[PDB]
Amino acid sequence: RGWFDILDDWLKRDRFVFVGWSGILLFPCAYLALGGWLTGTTFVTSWYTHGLASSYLEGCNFLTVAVSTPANSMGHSLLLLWGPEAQGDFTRWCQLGGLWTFIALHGAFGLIGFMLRQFEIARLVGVRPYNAIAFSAPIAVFVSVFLIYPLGQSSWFFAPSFGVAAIFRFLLFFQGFHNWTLNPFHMMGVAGVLGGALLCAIHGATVENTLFQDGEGASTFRAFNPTQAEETYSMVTANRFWSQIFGIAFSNKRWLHFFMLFVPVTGLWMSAIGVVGLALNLRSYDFISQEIRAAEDPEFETFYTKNLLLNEGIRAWMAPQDQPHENFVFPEEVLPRGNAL
């Protein structure tokens, strides 16, 4: 009955918000990630790192506020408040981009905290930890997109900024520079996400429309008792309906619910792998056989060549403003343009 055993008893006391040992990592970091985002989007500029306004105080709205990435000249600096760039000056820290690494790093450890919480709670209640295992895909996405991707590039500047419109800019950057829609790892991610939404909707609708009449009411929600032993819908009727509608159907409820875990989790993992490749500019940008043909045959045109022309427009029209540290000066005459527009 040492102090460790006593601290363990209090941490694991059953209260309204469970704490646990994992809480000591989780709660400070999550609160500070949250808090830093709300603080930066309300009060802090991106004027000296990006040449942009980015806070409510500057007149942005919920879609255009952001905690933006540090200037490219910071490289991959941790940007510690007490470090060589800000030298303990909080104001300068905000101006140089320190809230971005602040949120990214506290957020990283908060995510670790949350996964640890899933393990800790599962162990105490006596359930298998498949929910912790499922949470590895969001962690893979976050680590690959916010950390690995900028670490392979020139600086933190090219990571996603934390904001709605800033993430849309990120989307479009990845189209015009990486041809990311053409990447089979993203295609697998897309299939996993849309397949997960498909399964979500089809399983809920199927259960809602094969319920047993276990009550007299027209609202069927009151006819379920969480301690009842009986299945609340008919697996047998659901199976026959889908076999005759679609040709096949689930027959094993365990495989069904495992499959629901597997599909979106695997999708996010695949997309994470493609982003790691993009950290190094290892894109699936081109098809060589199409380029060889197209270069030789001015009559050969496909949707592949049409999209490259869009990518080229994106790159040249957005780069000067998007990468102000490069000092791109593009005269009008060099900008690619079709007729009239």
């Binding site: 490289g75 991959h76 600096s77 941790l78 510690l80 470090g83 060589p84």
Partner: protein
């Protein structure tokens, strides 16, 4: 099971399955070394990152 000459020579090395020091044993000492290791790794990371800049240490190819 099958006895061999080499087996007999090695036998004592695989004979204490399950034997433990009582209670917490050397756990306090392990914690100290872990925390020393953390600070150490932190120094190495921050030198590489140029968050920690030491006299005479130029983290560049020109070293």
């Amino acid at each position: 099971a099958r006895r061999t000459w080499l087996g007999d020579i090695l036998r004592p090395l695989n004979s204490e399955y399950g034997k433990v020091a009582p209670g917490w044993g050397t756990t306090p000492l392990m914690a100290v070394f872990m925390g020393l290791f953390l600070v150490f790794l932190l120094i190495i990371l921050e030198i590489y990152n140029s968050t920690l800049i030491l006299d005479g240490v130029n983290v560049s190819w020109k070293a």
